[PDB]
Write a structure and sequence with these properties.
The complex is a heterohexamer, with two copies of chain A, two copies of chain B and two copies of chain C. Chain A is of the alpha+beta class. Chain A has helices at residues 11-27, 31-46; strands spanning 3-9, 50-64, 68-74, 77-83. Chain A starts with a strand and ends with a strand. Classes of the chains: A alpha+beta, B mainly beta, C alpha+beta. Chains in contact: A-B, A-D, A-F, B-C, B-D, B-E, C-E, C-F, D-F, E-F. Chain A binds chain D through residues 30-36, 38-40, 48-63, 80, 84-85, and chain D through 30-36, 38-40, 48-63, 78, 80, 84-85. Chain B: It comes from Rattus norvegicus.
Chain lengths: 85, 29, 104, 85, 103, 27
């Protein structure tokens, strides 16, 4: 279903990111909302501070905590989720 | 009782510059 | 009977794993963690009904690239007393624990 | 034409942001590189750790330090540049 | 038989004598924690009492990092006592503890 | 005879920064 483009995160945590994103898409339509569901979900289960960007057209340059970064494709959007702070 | 000094124990975690990573992502098209 | 380093080391590692095993530094729970760690070890140590006085200390430092240095020595009965210091660390925490057993 | 949609930073720092963005846009065509240019200037002139997202279609939900956030559009392009050590 | 005001004074002095007026320097701190421990231990053992002493000292480089310590004992509340001292300067935090047990 | 003592604790809190959580969305 999902395609992990680039990642530095454990396998289970990666699976978790996909799972969380899968459900976020089933409940929201606007990009900014999908992000929130994800960002909030991770902050709770894996601790602050997380950041999520969801879209179909964007470039990025971010710095992150080791073992806490993932960029993947799911549905009709790209998903960037990373910890920093 | 015979009292005396024990061996000395020391723990030393040296200061280290944390290692962070900078990634770049790009949507295709 | 006598201070058995291997057992004491087991109790510490155990206590550590329970309290903070699988968590991230959070000033929130830290005070209660370090506290539970000493209390657990103490709970276990005393339960064995041995003829010893025990001292337990624990400290948790938020991993962050800061230098940390500790040292400890004693003036006791080098024949009946003992101690064990365990180092434990993970993604975000440096944890040191010590237990000193002094005979009756 | 620059349009500051949502900002939270020094009036001077905002200008600084828009300037750097403009220059970036006329040095690179790839969003990914656009971001890099911007993020690097702020890590340099304003200390780490900055994060930049340059795109034309995306939603997000991030956390940041006070006074260190800005989301301005430069033409059709959207720029997200916040700090979160 | 364990006077807390006494030991507290010894600790503080030992801290000052050793690191008072200096800044954190990795390859010098290990020597310092040891001195603070020896210093305190030397002073405490002179008055040859039927007491046992345990001395721990730790110095952390001020770097905005969090630090929490906790301790307790199973001893004789009527005889055994202890003193923990927090200390700090521009560059480092220091924590020293002394425990005294009779018999 | 023997009993427990107080739980002496020391606390050096980490420095904190005031933060916010924002959301953005292209039109």
């Amino acid at each position: 279903k999902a395609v992990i483009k680039n990642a530095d995160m454990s396998e289970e945590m990666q699976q978790d990111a996909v799972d969380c994103a899968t459900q976020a898409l089933e409940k929201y339509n606007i990009e900014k909302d999908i992000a929130a569901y994800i960002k909030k979900e991770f902050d709770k289960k894996y601790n602050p501070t997380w950041h999520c960007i969801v879209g179909r057209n964007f470039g990025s340059y971010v710095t992150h905590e080791t073992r806490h970064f993932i960029y993947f494709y799911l549905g009709q959007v790209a998903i960037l989720l990373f910890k920093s702070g | 009782i015979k009292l005396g000094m024990a061996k000395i124990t020391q723990v030393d975690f040296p200061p280290r510059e944390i290692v962070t990573y900078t990634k770049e992502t790009q949507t295709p098209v | 009977s006598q201070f058995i380093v291997d057992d004491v080391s087991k109790t510490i590692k155990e206590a550590i794993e329970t309290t903070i095993g699988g968590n991230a530094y959070q000033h929130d729970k830290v005070n209660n963690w370090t506290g539970q760690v000493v209390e657990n070890c103490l709970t276990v140590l005393t339960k064995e009904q041995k003829p010893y006085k025990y001292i337990v200390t624990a400290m948790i430092m938020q991993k962050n690239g800061a230098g940390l240095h500790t040292a400890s020595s004693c003036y006791w009965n080098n024949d009946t007393d003992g101690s064990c210091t365990v180092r434990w660390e993970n993604k975000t925490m440096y944890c040191i624990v010590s237990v000193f057993g002094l005979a009756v």
